[PDB]
From Swiss-Prot:
A zinc finger (PHD-type) spans 7-61. This is Death-inducer obliterator 1. It comes from the Eukaryota. The lineage of its organism: Eukaryota, Metazoa, Chordata, Craniata, Vertebrata. Putative transcription factor, weakly pro-apoptotic when overexpressed. Tumor suppressor. Required for early embryonic stem cell development. Ubiquitous. Changing W30T: Abolishes binding to H3K4me3. The PHD-type zinc finger forms an aromatic cage around H3K4me3.
Length: 61
């Protein structure tokens, strides 16, 4: 549910207190723009338009 500071979600399993991160509605988790490929400018755009982003892990799973 609510993302925590000392939690893990991304495939690499790292804290969100490092680099940019994105929220996936598919699995309802968090990921890294670098790991998924999304750019800081791209992820920020989907947040403004309100487009439910889907990590590359779910799209192929
Ligand atoms: Zn990662
Ligand atoms: Zn996902």
């Amino acid at each position: 549910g609510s993302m925590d500071p000392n939690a893990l979600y991304c495939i690499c399993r790292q804290p969100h207190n490092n680099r940019f991160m994105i929220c996936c509605d598919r699995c309802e988790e968090w990921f890294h723009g670098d790991c998924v490929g999304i750019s800081e400018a791209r992820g920020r755009l989907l947040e403004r338009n309100g487009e439910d982003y889907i990590c590359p892990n779910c799209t192929i799973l």
